């Protein structure tokens, strides 16, 4: 006799961790869900979990970890006003509890879905969901959404960020203003926040000049958004009633934040400031206030996000820029949220599987392949690629080249071998993070935002589990030696690529064109019909069917290193350039200049002893490079034109002392470090750290007799690989450009 | 109009102590927006740099700090 009823479930977030009594190796974690019955009437539902020491462990990766850490991070959190931004101690630990607490939620109650149709129970007795159980019947309400935009001027003191950024050098300053603010949460009572969300109902919007004071400016109220409920719960940790209060989200689901200059420090104090609002008044339990994004690592991270681990329970997604597509980005955000249960981007490669069962499943997976790529894996060392290649100081042409590429290779392989090794995995329940993946790989050719997922859960999860990479390049290795055995029979010669990307040629003669699309497409269907039966062979068996795209017809192909490669198809003037580093706005067009010297310098093709080609092909690209400096000078004001992305990995011109007072801009540095020399005085160059500064900016003159020069030195190796590849070698094409050209800056 | 006779003259003209001070003061409000700090020859080279920083635009030049005027 348990009630039963008819919801979908928007967000699911964490409560309560807590220790039972007579314990010491499971702890017990209450989730809130957020559900939302037909024509979008929501009621809130809670759950309990039992996460044991293991299980920690295992999605740790490291036994460092215990349940008393876990209990004091989580009592840690319970207050705001004490302490807020507690994740940045071990932001790992962090993650690690939502994936156990969403693995614990997926076995032990059963599977869950958000934005899905799902019968949901409940015991009175106690009051909590029983049992999820995915429902067949409903045309669910449309996740609906609020905007909602907050900017905060927190008076961080500078001195501060610099000393923390010097105990750790290369660290994100957006990690040193969140330092700051968890040293001295009294920072975050006092800011000049502005809020603004506005719903399709009604909008709300409210202004502070110190935070915990009154507001300045009012509009609407908290209770048009929020209904606030008081529930009564009886875990089977809690023996006495327990009652929890939540905001339930009426009129919206889930948030969305521009990422143009979106401040995790602001949204932070806005929802500690909710929180000490909404839990001043005592007799109910107070929740987690955990919030996961780059900005909580020293380092950072690739893509934004905004975790919403605990309070107040509602998913916020920050969409940076991209105005022309923003429905394309914000769907994109609500379908990643929905897949892969939220978990994604803040767990990390643990959505798929904990971060050491993983070592069980590559050596499960070693061992149902055949025979010769059993050894193939074991015999991986990086950058191998054991096939006929061509020396990268060479060139091709007038034949008819061919690119193509297997759409997701990578994914689709991690996928196979993954249910290669889930006969392996300890549970049979534990595997629906491998039903997660087999999702995005489906649908990744159906809608591009599985894709950016896959394009990041995979590196990560080779990462994660090191024993991978070894298993993955050589199942491609495999790949690439079939595709190499297939190529000879339908005319096709390997010549370069990356495996899932390889380029060739044709042997049929190159002025015929109505059968060279025969070849060229009998040659993708032979290649990729042989790819598939060797994987079938090798029992790998992908979840969506196998597919070769042409990614271009071209007639001339020129390659300098190992990733750089020119195609031009002569007849309708289509080319592609890789390899040229696109490191800010001016290598756009270096790159642009260069994609025209060398389709000027291949239609030299009129009838010339080979010697005299190679004069009349270095004056043109002299005269690219003066054509190019030239307008360099144009633009020499133009500092964020002449601006270097550095990555926190790379060597980094130290940040002058007074970056460190941009105020709400540090927070908008997450991966990159755009830097800019400019030429103060005289003789020194030093680094501006251009978005660290206010707009206009006023600079000495921007030393372009600094970055004029690494653009020139790549523009010289591609020219050098083209002089040296096409016509005879030993010409290093050099432009002097301290002696020629130099006077224009300097 | 650098060079055009003109009915009064408009600039910065001190002894080298006060132009010293007056350059850090102009720094002062030039620092917030970029320029590094240069923590008679130092107060010759940054007068130089400072007179060659050219116009961005309708913004007014670096040096109108010191010269204190949009004309400029």
Same mark, same amino acid.
């Given at each position: 006799?348990?009630?039963?009823?008819?919801?979908?479930?928007?967000?699911?977030?964490?409560?309560?961790?807590?220790?039972?009594?007579?314990?010491?190796?499971?702890?017990?974690?209450?989730?809130?869900?957020?559900?939302?019955?037909?024509?979008?009437?929501?009621?809130?539902?809670?759950?309990?979990?039992?996460?044991?020491?293991?299980?920690?462990?295992?999605?740790?990766?490291?036994?460092?970890?215990?349940?008393?850490?876990?209990?004091?991070? *989580?009592?840690?959190?319970?207050?705001?006003?004490?302490?807020?931004?507690?994740?940045?101690?071990?932001?790992?630990?962090?993650?690690?509890?939502?994936?156990?607490?969403?693995?614990?939620?997926?076995?032990?109650?059963?599977?869950?879905?958000?934005?899905?149709?799902?019968?949901?129970?409940?015991?009175?007795?106690?009051?909590?969901?029983?049992?999820?159980?995915?429902?067949?019947?409903?045309?669910?309400?449309?996740?609906?959404?609020?905007?909602?935009? *907050?900017?905060?001027?927190?008076?961080?003191?500078?001195?501060?960020?610099?000393?923390?950024?010097?105990?750790?050098?290369?660290?994100?300053?957006?990690?040193?203003?969140?330092?700051?603010?968890?040293?001295?949460?009294?920072?975050?009572?006092?800011?000049?926040?502005?809020?603004? =969300?506005?719903?399709?109902?009604?909008?709300?919007?409210?202004?502070?000049?110190?935070?915990?004071?009154?507001?300045?400016?009012?509009?609407?109220?908290?209770?048009?958004?929020?209904?606030?409920?008081?529930?009564?719960?009886?875990?089977?940790?809690?023996?006495?009633?327990?009652?929890?209060?939540?905001?339930?989200?009426?009129?919206?689901?889930?948030?969305?934040?521009?990422?143009?200059?979106?401040?995790?420090?602001?949204?932070?104090?806005?929802?500690?400031?909710?929180?000490?609002?909404?839990?001043?008044?005592?007799?109910?339990?107070?929740?987690?206030?955990?919030?996961?994004?780059?900005?909580?690592?020293?380092?950072?991270?690739?893509?934004?996000?905004?975790?919403?681990?605990?309070?107040?329970?509602?998913?916020?997604?920050?969409?940076?820029?991209?105005?022309?597509?923003?429905?394309?980005?914000?769907?994109?955000?609500?379908?990643? +949220?929905?897949?892969?249960?939220?978990?994604?981007?803040? @767990?990390?490669?643990?959505?798929?599987?904990?971060?050491?069962?993983?070592?069980?499943?590559?050596?499960?997976?070693?061992?149902?392949?055949?025979?010769?790529?059993?050894?193939?894996?074991?015999?991986?060392?990086?950058?191998?690629? =054991?096939?006929?290649?061509?020396?990268?100081?060479?060139?091709?042409?007038?034949?008819?080249?061919?690119?193509? %590429?297997?759409?997701?290779?990578?994914?689709?392989?991690?996928?196979?071998?993954?249910?290669?090794?889930?006969?392996?995995?300890?549970?049979?329940?534990?595997?629906?993070?491998?039903?997660?993946?087999?999702?995005?790989?489906?649908?990744?050719?159906?809608?591009?935002?599985?894709?950016?997922?896959?394009?990041?859960? @995979?590196?990560?999860?080779?990462?994660?589990?090191? *024993?991978?990479?070894?298993?993955?390049?050589?199942?491609?290795?495999?790949? %690439?030696?079939?595709?190499?055995?297939?190529?000879?029979?339908?005319?096709?010669?390997?010549?370069?690529?990356?495996?899932?990307?390889?380029?060739?040629?044709?042997?049929?003669?190159?002025?015929?064109?109505?059968?060279?699309?025969?070849? =060229?497409?009998?040659?993708?269907?032979?290649?990729?019909?042989?790819?598939?039966?060797?994987?079938?062979?090798?029992? @790998?068996?992908?979840?969506?069917?196998?597919?070769?795209?042409?990614?271009?017809? +071209?007639?001339?192909?020129?390659?300098?290193?190992?990733?750089?490669?020119?195609?031009?198809?002569?007849?309708?003037?289509?080319?592609?350039?890789?390899?040229?580093?696109?490191?800010?706005?001016?290598?756009?067009?270096?790159?642009?200049?260069?994609?025209?010297?060398?389709?000027?310098?291949?239609?030299?093709?009129?009838?010339?002893?080979?010697?005299?080609?190679?004069?009349?092909?270095?004056?043109?690209?002299?005269?690219?490079?003066?054509?190019?400096?030239?307008?360099?000078?144009?633009?020499?004001?133009?500092?964020?034109?002449?601006?270097?992305?550095?990555?926190?990995?790379?060597?980094?011109?130290?940040?002058?002392?007074?970056?460190?007072?941009?105020?709400?801009?540090?927070?908008?540095?997450?991966?990159?470090?755009?830097?800019?020399? @400019?030429?103060?005085?005289?003789?020194?160059?030093?680094?501006?750290?251009?978005?660290?500064?206010?707009?206009?900016?006023?600079?000495?003159?921007?030393?372009?007799?600094?970055?004029?020069?690494?653009?020139?030195?790549?523009?010289?190796?591609?020219?050098?690989?083209?002089?040296?590849?096409?016509?005879?070698?030993?010409?290093?094409?050099? +432009?002097?450009?301290?002696?020629?050209?130099?006077?224009?800056?300097? | 109009?650098?060079?055009?006779?003109?009915?009064? +003259? %408009?600039?910065?003209?001190?002894?080298?102590?006060?132009?010293?001070?007056?350059?850090?003061?102009?720094?002062?409000?030039?620092?917030?927006?970029?320029?590094?700090?240069?923590?008679? %020859?130092?107060?010759?080279?940054?007068?130089?740099?400072?007179?060659?920083?050219?116009?961005?635009?309708?913004?007014?030049? *670096?040096?109108?700090?010191?010269?204190?005027?949009?004309?400029?």
């Amino acid at each position: 006799d348990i009630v039963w009823v008819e919801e979908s479930v928007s967000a699911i977030t964490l409560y309560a961790v807590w220790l039972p009594p007579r314990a010491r190796e499971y702890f017990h974690a209450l989730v809130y869900f957020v559900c939302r019955n037909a024509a979008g009437e929501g009621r809130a539902r809670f759950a309990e979990v039992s996460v044991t020491a293991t299980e920690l462990r295992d999605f740790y990766g490291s036994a460092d970890v215990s349940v008393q850490a876990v209990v004091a991070a *989580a009592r840690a959190a319970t207050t705001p006003a004490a302490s807020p931004l507690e994740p940045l101690e071990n932001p790992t630990l962090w993650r690690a509890l939502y994936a156990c607490v969403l693995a614990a939620l997926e076995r032990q109650t059963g599977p869950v879905a958000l934005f899905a149709p799902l019968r949901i129970g409940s015991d009175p007795r106690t009051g909590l969901v029983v049992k999820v159980e995915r429902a067949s019947w409903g045309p669910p309400a449309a996740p609906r959404a609020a905007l909602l935009v *907050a900017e905060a001027n927190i008076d961080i003191d500078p001195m501060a960020l610099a000393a923390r950024v010097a105990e750790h050098p290369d660290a994100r300053l957006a990690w040193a203003r969140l330092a700051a603010i968890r040293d001295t949460p009294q920072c975050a009572s006092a800011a000049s926040l502005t809020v603004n =969300i506005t719903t399709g109902t009604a909008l709300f919007a409210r202004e502070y000049q110190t935070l915990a004071f009154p507001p300045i400016k009012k509009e609407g109220a908290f209770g048009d958004l929020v209904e606030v409920c008081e529930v009564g719960l009886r875990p089977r940790g809690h023996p006495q009633r327990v009652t929890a209060r939540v905001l339930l989200p009426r009129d919206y689901d889930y948030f969305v934040s521009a990422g143009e200059k979106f401040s995790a420090p602001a949204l932070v104090a806005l929802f500690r400031q909710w929180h000490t609002t909404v839990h001043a008044a005592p007799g109910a339990l107070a929740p987690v206030f955990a919030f996961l994004g780059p900005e909580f690592e020293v380092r950072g991270g690739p893509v934004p996000y905004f975790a919403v681990l605990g309070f107040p329970g509602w998913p916020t997604f920050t969409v940076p820029a991209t105005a022309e597509s923003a429905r394309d980005l914000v769907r994109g955000a609500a379908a990643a +949220y929905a897949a892969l249960l939220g978990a994604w981007p803040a @767990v990390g490669a643990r959505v798929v599987l904990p971060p050491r069962a993983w070592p069980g499943v590559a050596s499960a997976a070693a061992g149902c392949l055949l025979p010769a790529v059993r050894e193939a894996v074991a015999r991986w060392h990086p950058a191998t690629k =054991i096939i006929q290649l061509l020396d990268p100081p060479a060139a091709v042409g007038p034949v008819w080249t061919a690119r193509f %590429c297997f759409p997701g290779l990578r994914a689709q392989l991690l996928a196979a071998l993954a249910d290669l090794g889930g006969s392996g995995l300890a549970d049979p329940h534990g595997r629906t993070g491998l039903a997660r993946l087999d999702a995005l790989v489906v649908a990744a050719p159906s809608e591009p935002w599985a894709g950016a997922v896959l394009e990041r859960l @995979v590196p990560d999860t080779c990462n994660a589990c090191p *024993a991978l990479r070894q298993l993955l390049g050589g199942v491609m290795a495999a790949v %690439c030696l079939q595709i190499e055995e297939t190529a000879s029979s339908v005319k096709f010669a390997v010549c370069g690529g990356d495996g899932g990307a390889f380029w060739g040629v044709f042997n049929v003669d190159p002025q015929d064109a109505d059968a060279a699309s025969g070849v =060229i497409e009998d040659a993708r269907r032979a290649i990729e019909t042989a790819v598939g039966a060797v994987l079938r062979a090798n029992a @790998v068996r992908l979840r969506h069917p196998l597919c070769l795209a042409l990614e271009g017809v +071209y007639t001339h192909a020129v390659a300098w290193s190992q990733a750089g490669v020119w195609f031009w198809n002569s007849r309708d003037n289509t080319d592609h350039l890789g390899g040229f580093p696109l490191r800010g706005p001016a290598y756009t067009t270096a790159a642009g200049v260069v994609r025209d010297t060398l389709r000027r310098v291949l239609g030299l093709t009129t009838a010339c002893v080979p010697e005299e080609d190679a004069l009349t092909a270095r004056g043109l690209m002299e005269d690219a490079c003066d054509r190019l400096i030239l307008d360099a000078f144009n633009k020499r004001l133009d500092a964020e034109y002449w601006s270097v992305r550095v990555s926190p990995f790379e060597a980094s011109d130290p940040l002058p002392p007074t970056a460190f007072r941009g105020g709400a801009l540090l927070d908008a540095e997450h991966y990159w470090r755009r830097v800019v020399r @400019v030429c103060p005085g005289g003789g020194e160059s030093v680094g501006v750290p251009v978005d660290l500064y206010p707009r206009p900016l006023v600079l000495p003159p921007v030393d372009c007799a600094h970055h004029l020069r690494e653009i020139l030195r790549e523009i010289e190796l591609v020219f050098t690989g083209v002089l040296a590849g096409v016509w005879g070698e030993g010409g290093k094409f050099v +432009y002097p450009f301290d002696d020629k050209m130099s006077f224009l800056f300097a | 109009g650098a060079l055009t006779p003109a009915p009064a +003259y %408009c600039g910065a003209v001190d002894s080298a102590t006060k132009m010293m001070g007056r350059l850090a003061d102009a720094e002062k409000l030039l620092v917030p927006r970029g320029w590094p700090a240069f923590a008679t %020859c130092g107060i010759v080279k940054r007068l130089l740099r400072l007179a060659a920083t050219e116009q961005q635009g309708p913004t007014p030049p *670096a040096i109108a700090a010191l010269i204190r005027n949009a004309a400029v």
